[PDB]
Design an enzyme around this catalytic site. Structure first.
Site, PDB file in Angstrom:
ATOM      1  N   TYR A 225       0.828  -1.199   0.000  1.00 30.45           N
ATOM      2  CA  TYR A 225       0.000   0.000   0.000  1.00 30.45           C
ATOM      3  C   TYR A 225       0.877   1.271   0.000  1.00 30.45           C
ATOM      4  O   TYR A 225       1.999   1.285   0.510  1.00 30.45           O
ATOM      5  CB  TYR A 225      -0.983   0.005   1.185  1.00 30.45           C
ATOM      6  CG  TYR A 225      -0.338   0.352   2.516  1.00 30.45           C
ATOM      7  CD1 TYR A 225      -0.224   1.656   2.924  1.00 30.45           C
ATOM      8  CD2 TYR A 225       0.274  -0.627   3.303  1.00 30.45           C
ATOM      9  CE1 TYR A 225       0.427   1.995   4.091  1.00 30.45           C
ATOM     10  CE2 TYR A 225       0.929  -0.305   4.488  1.00 30.45           C
ATOM     11  CZ  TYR A 225       1.004   1.006   4.886  1.00 30.45           C
ATOM     12  OH  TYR A 225       1.634   1.349   6.038  1.00 30.45           O
TER      13      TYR A 225
ATOM     14  N   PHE B 194       2.755  10.998   3.988  1.00 36.43           N
ATOM     15  CA  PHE B 194       2.760   9.935   2.992  1.00 36.43           C
ATOM     16  C   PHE B 194       3.426   8.681   3.569  1.00 36.43           C
ATOM     17  O   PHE B 194       4.500   8.795   4.119  1.00 36.43           O
ATOM     18  CB  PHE B 194       3.531  10.486   1.775  1.00 36.43           C
ATOM     19  CG  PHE B 194       3.396   9.610   0.523  1.00 36.43           C
ATOM     20  CD1 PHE B 194       4.312   8.585   0.251  1.00 36.43           C
ATOM     21  CD2 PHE B 194       2.340   9.785  -0.373  1.00 36.43           C
ATOM     22  CE1 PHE B 194       4.186   7.764  -0.874  1.00 36.43           C
ATOM     23  CE2 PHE B 194       2.207   8.963  -1.504  1.00 36.43           C
ATOM     24  CZ  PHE B 194       3.141   7.964  -1.758  1.00 36.43           C
ATOM     25  N   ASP B 195       2.834   7.490   3.418  1.00 40.97           N
ATOM     26  CA  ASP B 195       3.304   6.273   4.057  1.00 40.97           C
ATOM     27  C   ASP B 195       3.213   5.140   3.046  1.00 40.97           C
ATOM     28  O   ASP B 195       2.224   5.026   2.328  1.00 40.97           O
ATOM     29  CB  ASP B 195       2.517   5.919   5.313  1.00 40.97           C
ATOM     30  CG  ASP B 195       2.767   4.517   5.859  1.00 40.97           C
ATOM     31  OD1 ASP B 195       3.918   4.046   5.807  1.00 40.97           O
ATOM     32  OD2 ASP B 195       1.783   3.851   6.271  1.00 40.97           O
TER      33      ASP B 195
ATOM     34  N   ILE C 262      -7.797   0.611  10.625  1.00 38.30           N
ATOM     35  CA  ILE C 262      -8.992   1.436  10.536  1.00 38.30           C
ATOM     36  C   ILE C 262     -10.151   0.697   9.827  1.00 38.30           C
ATOM     37  O   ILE C 262      -9.960  -0.182   8.998  1.00 38.30           O
ATOM     38  CB  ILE C 262      -8.697   2.771   9.848  1.00 38.30           C
ATOM     39  CG1 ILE C 262      -8.134   2.602   8.407  1.00 38.30           C
ATOM     40  CG2 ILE C 262      -7.797   3.646  10.706  1.00 38.30           C
ATOM     41  CD1 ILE C 262      -7.981   3.932   7.663  1.00 38.30           C
TER      42      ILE C 262
ATOM     43  N   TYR D 102      -9.807   7.958  11.498  1.00 35.97           N
ATOM     44  CA  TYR D 102      -9.372   8.386  12.815  1.00 35.97           C
ATOM     45  C   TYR D 102     -10.327   9.397  13.460  1.00 35.97           C
ATOM     46  O   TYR D 102     -10.040   9.920  14.531  1.00 35.97           O
ATOM     47  CB  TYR D 102      -7.960   8.926  12.727  1.00 35.97           C
ATOM     48  CG  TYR D 102      -6.969   7.837  12.330  1.00 35.97           C
ATOM     49  CD1 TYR D 102      -6.637   6.814  13.193  1.00 35.97           C
ATOM     50  CD2 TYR D 102      -6.543   7.730  11.008  1.00 35.97           C
ATOM     51  CE1 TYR D 102      -5.765   5.799  12.813  1.00 35.97           C
ATOM     52  CE2 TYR D 102      -5.671   6.739  10.611  1.00 35.97           C
ATOM     53  CZ  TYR D 102      -5.321   5.729  11.500  1.00 35.97           C
ATOM     54  OH  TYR D 102      -4.472   4.765  11.073  1.00 35.97           O
TER      55      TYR D 102
ATOM     56  N   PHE E 185      -5.771   5.760  -0.031  1.00 34.48           N
ATOM     57  CA  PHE E 185      -4.820   4.677  -0.183  1.00 34.48           C
ATOM     58  C   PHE E 185      -4.886   4.080  -1.590  1.00 34.48           C
ATOM     59  O   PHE E 185      -5.954   3.992  -2.196  1.00 34.48           O
ATOM     60  CB  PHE E 185      -5.091   3.538   0.805  1.00 34.48           C
ATOM     61  CG  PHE E 185      -4.878   3.860   2.276  1.00 34.48           C
ATOM     62  CD1 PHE E 185      -5.909   4.440   3.011  1.00 34.48           C
ATOM     63  CD2 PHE E 185      -3.666   3.543   2.928  1.00 34.48           C
ATOM     64  CE1 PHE E 185      -5.734   4.721   4.362  1.00 34.48           C
ATOM     65  CE2 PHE E 185      -3.506   3.839   4.270  1.00 34.48           C
ATOM     66  CZ  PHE E 185      -4.534   4.425   4.973  1.00 34.48           C
TER      67      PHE E 185
HETATM   68  C1  LIG Z   1      -2.012   6.034  13.160  1.00 36.80           C
HETATM   69  O1  LIG Z   1      -0.735   5.423  13.052  1.00 36.80           O
HETATM   70  C2  LIG Z   1      -0.273   5.053  11.832  1.00 36.80           C
HETATM   71  C3  LIG Z   1      -0.984   5.193  10.629  1.00 36.80           C
HETATM   72  C4  LIG Z   1      -0.386   4.835   9.428  1.00 36.80           C
HETATM   73  C5  LIG Z   1       0.929   4.361   9.444  1.00 36.80           C
HETATM   74  C6  LIG Z   1       1.654   4.243  10.630  1.00 36.80           C
HETATM   75  C7  LIG Z   1       1.053   4.601  11.837  1.00 36.80           C
HETATM   76  O2  LIG Z   1       1.773   4.525  13.010  1.00 36.80           O
HETATM   77  C8  LIG Z   1       1.461   3.385  13.865  1.00 36.80           C
HETATM   78  O3  LIG Z   1       2.980   3.839  10.683  1.00 36.80           O
HETATM   79  C9  LIG Z   1       3.393   2.473  10.907  1.00 36.80           C
HETATM   80  C10 LIG Z   1       4.887   2.456  11.189  1.00 36.80           C
HETATM   81  C11 LIG Z   1       3.131   1.573   9.734  1.00 36.80           C
HETATM   82  C12 LIG Z   1       2.861   0.179  10.181  1.00 36.80           C
HETATM   83  N1  LIG Z   1       1.568   0.072  10.844  1.00 36.80           N
HETATM   84  C13 LIG Z   1       0.361  -0.237  10.336  1.00 36.80           C
HETATM   85  C14 LIG Z   1      -0.522  -0.123  11.374  1.00 36.80           C
HETATM   86  N2  LIG Z   1       0.201   0.192  12.478  1.00 36.80           N
HETATM   87  N3  LIG Z   1       1.476   0.344  12.157  1.00 36.80           N
HETATM   88  C15 LIG Z   1      -1.987  -0.421  11.417  1.00 36.80           C
HETATM   89  C16 LIG Z   1      -2.833   0.515  12.286  1.00 36.80           C
HETATM   90  C17 LIG Z   1      -2.853   1.958  11.870  1.00 36.80           C
HETATM   91  O4  LIG Z   1      -2.915   2.158  10.420  1.00 36.80           O
HETATM   92  C18 LIG Z   1      -4.073   1.944   9.807  1.00 36.80           C
HETATM   93  O5  LIG Z   1      -4.990   1.341  10.286  1.00 36.80           O
HETATM   94  C19 LIG Z   1      -3.979   2.396   8.350  1.00 36.80           C
HETATM   95  C20 LIG Z   1      -4.175   1.169   7.455  1.00 36.80           C
HETATM   96  C21 LIG Z   1      -3.041   0.210   7.429  1.00 36.80           C
HETATM   97  C22 LIG Z   1      -1.814   0.921   6.944  1.00 36.80           C
HETATM   98  C23 LIG Z   1      -1.505   2.179   7.771  1.00 36.80           C
HETATM   99  N4  LIG Z   1      -2.693   3.038   8.036  1.00 36.80           N
HETATM  100  C24 LIG Z   1      -2.567   4.354   8.242  1.00 36.80           C
HETATM  101  O6  LIG Z   1      -3.510   4.971   8.693  1.00 36.80           O
HETATM  102  C25 LIG Z   1      -1.179   4.992   8.123  1.00 36.80           C
HETATM  103  C26 LIG Z   1      -1.308   6.486   7.743  1.00 36.80           C
HETATM  104  C27 LIG Z   1      -1.945   6.657   6.357  1.00 36.80           C
HETATM  105  C28 LIG Z   1      -2.025   8.100   5.936  1.00 36.80           C
HETATM  106  C29 LIG Z   1      -0.702   8.851   5.996  1.00 36.80           C
HETATM  107  C30 LIG Z   1      -0.125   8.726   7.395  1.00 36.80           C
HETATM  108  C31 LIG Z   1       0.018   7.226   7.776  1.00 36.80           C
END
Ligand SMILES: COc1cc2cc(c1OC)O[C@H](C)CCn1cc(nn1)CCCOC(=O)[C@@H]1CCCCN1C(=O)[C@H]2C1CCCCC1
Length: 128
Positions: free
Chosen positions: A45, A55-56, A75, A101, A118
């Site tokens: 992703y 951006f991630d 989420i 969130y 995403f």
């Molecule tokens: C709110 O915190 C984060 C959100 C997002 C990335 C984050 C993060 O720090 C914990 O960096 C992590 C180092 C990536 C690995 N990862 C995935 C999840 N937890 N860690 C799963 C739970 C949280 O993430 C989500 O549920 C979603 C879907 C799965 C992929 C990551 N997700 C995100 O929300 C990213 C976010 C997306 C938008 C830009 C900023 C990062």
């Protein structure tokens, strides 16, 4: 951009039909099977705030992101969206804050009331 294309043409995949999770299939997958709750799911992703300010990417780990579907490991928009995908599929999701969130956000990385975008590739999924 990709987010605007989803706003305008994306399919509303919420049960409530509140446009909280909008999907475009970008690459069609294989077979008719989509994953069940409990299934171990493997994805690549890229994600961003719709503003583009954060951006991630799993690609930057060079390794897939793995989670169990429908166990609130992610989420709500992912449990909903990845559940509609086939092995090999690539999809775009645009997500209202209620399915990400919310009003609280997840500061400091995610602000209050943030819309997320995403691109997801479903690599594989396996039974519990
Ligand atoms: C709110 O915190 C984060 C959100 C997002 C990335 C984050 C993060 O720090 C914990 O960096 C992590 C180092 C990536 C690995 N990862 C995935 C999840 N937890 N860690 C799963 C739970 C949280 O993430 C989500 O549920 C979603 C879907 C799965 C992929 C990551 N997700 C995100 O929300 C990213 C976010 C997306 C938008 C830009 C900023 C990062």
């Amino acid at each position: 951009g990709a987010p605007a294309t989803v706003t305008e043409q994306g399919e509303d995949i919420t049960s409530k039909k509140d446009r909280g999770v909008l999907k475009i299939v970008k690459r069609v997958g294989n077979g008719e099977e989509t994953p069940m709750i409990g299934d171990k799911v493997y994805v690549h992703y890229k994600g961003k705030l719709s503003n583009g300010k954060k951006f991630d990417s799993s690609h930057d780990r060079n390794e897939p992101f793995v989670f169990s579907l429908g166990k609130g490991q992610v989420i709500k928009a992912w449990d909903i969206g990845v559940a509609t995908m086939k092995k090999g599929e690539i999809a775009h999701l645009l997500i209202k804050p209620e399915y990400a969130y919310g009003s609280a956000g997840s500061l400091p990385k995610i602000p209050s009331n943030a819309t997320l975008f995403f691109e997801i590739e479903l690599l594989d999924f396996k039974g519990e």
